[PDB]
Amino acid sequence: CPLMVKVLDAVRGSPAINVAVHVFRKAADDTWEPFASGKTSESGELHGLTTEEEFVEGIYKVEIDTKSYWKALGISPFHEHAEVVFTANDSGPRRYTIAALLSPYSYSTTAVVTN
Amino acid sequence: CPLMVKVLDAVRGSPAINVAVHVFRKAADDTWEPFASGKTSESGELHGLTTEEEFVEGIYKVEIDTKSYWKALGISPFHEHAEVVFTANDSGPRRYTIAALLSPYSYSTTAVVTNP
Amino acid sequence: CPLMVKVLDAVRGSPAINVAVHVFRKAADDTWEPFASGKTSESGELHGLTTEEEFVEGIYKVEIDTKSYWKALGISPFHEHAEVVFTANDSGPRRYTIAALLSPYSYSTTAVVTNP
Amino acid sequence: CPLMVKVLDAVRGSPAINVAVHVFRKAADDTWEPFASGKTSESGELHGLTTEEEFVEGIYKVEIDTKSYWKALGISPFHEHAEVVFTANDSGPRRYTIAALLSPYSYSTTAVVTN
Ligand SMILES: COc1ccc2c(c1)c(CC(=O)O)c(C)n2C(=O)c1ccc(Cl)cc1
Ligand SMILES: COc1ccc2c(c1)c(CC(=O)O)c(C)n2C(=O)c1ccc(Cl)cc1
Secondary structure (H helix, E strand, C coil), rough: CCEEEEECCCCCCCEECCCCEEEEECCCCCCEEEEEECCCCCCCCCCCCCCCCCCCCCCEEECCCHHHHHHHCCCCCCCEEEEEEEEEEEEEECCCEEEEEEECEEEEEEEEEEE | EEEEEEECCCCCCCCCCCCCEEEEECCCCCCCCEEEEEEEECCCEEECCCCCCCCCCCEEEEEHHHHHHHHHHHCCCCCEEEEEEEECCCCECCEEEEEEECCCCCEEEEEEECCC | CEEEEEECCCCCCCECCEEEEEEEEEECCCCEEEEEEEEECCEEECCCCCCCCCCCCCEEEEEEEHHHHHCCCCCCCCEEEEEEEEEECCEEEEEEEEEEEEEEEEEEEEEEECCC | EEEEEEECCCCCCEECCCCCEEEEECCCCCCEEEEEEEECCCEEEECCCCCCCCCCCCEEEEEECCCHHHHHHHCCCCCEEEEEEEEECCCCCCEEEEEEEEEEEEEEEEEEEEC
16 A cells, blocks of 8 residues: 555544545646545545555645535635645655645645655 | 735744745636746745735635755755645635645645635 | 744634733743743734843743633633743844644644844 | 554654653642653554553643654754643543644644544
8 A cells, every 4th residue: 555645633633534535646748637536434544545556656646625524514614625746756665644634724734654 | 915825944943935836716617727926035925916806706726836945955855835725705805824834744734814 | 022922723714812821931940930921912923922131041831721712712622722842042042933823633833933 | 542642753754753752640739740651663653651540531741852853863953842731531532642743843733532
């Protein structure tokens, strides 16, 4: 599992569950090609997005649908979605965890890159 | 000034100076049209991007070029840039401050929205 | 103004207004002595806590009373308060801005330190 | 394991390893009583701090020695340590994860409280 996503909710202090996540890979014409998607689980996590064969070096974008998550909770959010854009590179450690901590008007995102 | 950008460096405890910022607006055909651009100053702030009249309702994308910034400090950062995407002015004109706190493998972004 | 405090609310996208702040300074006997206190204004800022002369070298603790703040908004927050603990002025006088971004179960704190 | 600590490093994008963590419980005279301590592991985590029998309701303080972590990396940090102060309460979910994301001049901390 070379690419994992973890989403937490900073208002409730819980995993953010059932959050839609879309991954895109940057194509040679600079457009964004759908690559992988899913919904976070009960633990706020999304696994099994891709395999080490398909996850080649390149620029990827992870798009976390935060606006629908907040609307389902009845809370009026600022952002359309959170967007994490990064280059996957074979030299460094192999596992990428993209984490996001969500508030209605703020979010943070971190990359944990390990072996 | 209805749209301003404020960038901090979380490694140096200082404003993030000369950070490039590109703003886009989603057009009717659903593409991102170039809306305004600039660089943060000595105070890590970017003002005068647009005017109330020009800053109409729509979905905006503020792209803060963090990777260029880090590289010139000799750091090799994780992200290409920070993207901040939001509906603006969809209940009448507001003032928006987009703030970003940068680390090489992390950033946070918040909005302060006030009513004229 | 050598020590100022800036507080944002990450749920409302607004300054955090009327947040109580207590600053302490570690004394020679190793206890926390009361140093200064105040409340954030309409802009979420707190100024005039101390003077350059009074703000000598030492270890300071800025306690931001976040739990009181959240409760008055009807929220039941996780933390009692944010604590920010740092050596100040140990290479000559500096200006410090302590910033905090509050959510009910999370906060972030950053320092902007500048040289007179 | 009612109380777990997770520490990440925002400059390297890795777990923060070998970080000392001291937990205190607030005594009736308002002083801080040492309660539990340890060092984060290779995965940036600290487990086995306490048991559900000893972790009674009360105010606790978790003190993460960030200054020594940054000094070991040769990086000049702002804070003496990060301090997470909170009330443990029996009504809510049972597992407390205190997470901290560290930069030299900034940190964030989040509580994930679950079942
Ligand atoms: C009211 O509008 C803002 C918003 C955020 C601000 C400031 C002003 C100032 C002060 C100034 O205007 O110079 C600082 C220092 N801000 C931050 O620290 C900051 C940076 C990034 C994040 Cl994610 C959260 C907060
Ligand atoms: C429940 O377990 C957690 C909790 C938080 C986590 C992670 C795992 C991972 C995954 C990992 O460690 O690989 C990351 C990246 N987390 C963060 O990003 C994070 C974000 C904000 C703060 Cl304030 C503190 C930590």
